């Protein structure tokens, strides 16, 4: 990767705790009789020829999914495991459900009178105060 994928054009997904990973969707593979094999991808990846001894350890499956993590760990997985450990990281990912308010159906460590929501005093949204009936 000459480019560090700084531009969020290609959708990169989420490892176990929130590390970034690239997803290499193995379409088909061309096993050449010389020993080397090129893996056909239809994402931000083309055919990639790998050396014979290399293809002998990294011989995967056509139709599966491979990933490449920032640790240098690249492996092929079944979509069920692949998606839940190297793409999802909880069924929210970017948590765009909570938006910027972060208090939709989730409470992302709201400090009550958050300055970016209610500066000084006088909270807005949800009547006037969430606790108004003790």
Sign, CA dihedral 120-124-128-134, equals negative
Q: How was this structure determined?
A: NMR
Q: From residue 66, give the alpha-carbon distance in Å to each of 40, 73, 89, 101, 130.
A: 12, 10, 17, 35, 47
How far is residue 118's CA from residue 122's CA, in Å, rounded to a whole number?
Answer: 6
Q: Which residues contact 21 (CB under 8 A, 6 or more apart)?
A: 12, 13, 14, 15, 67, 68, 69, 70, 86, 87
């Amino acid at each position: 990767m000459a480019n560090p994928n700084f531009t969020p054009s290609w959708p990169l997904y989420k490892d176990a705790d929130g590390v970034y990973v690239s997803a290499l969707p193995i379409k088909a593979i061309k096993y050449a009789n010389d020993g080397s094999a090129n893996a056909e991808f239809d994402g931000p990846y083309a055919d990639q020829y790998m050396s014979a001894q290399t293809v002998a350890v990294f011989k995967p499956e056509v139709g599966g999914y491979l990933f490449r993590s920032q640790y240098g760990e690249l492996l092929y997985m079944s979509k069920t495991a692949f998606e839940a450990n190297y793409t999802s990281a909880s069924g929210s990912v970017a948590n765009a459900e909570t938006a910027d308010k972060l208090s939709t159906a989730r409470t992302i460590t709201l400090t009550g009178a958050v300055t970016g929501s209610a500066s000084f005093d006088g909270s807005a949204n949800v009547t006037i105060e969430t606790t108004s009936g003790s």
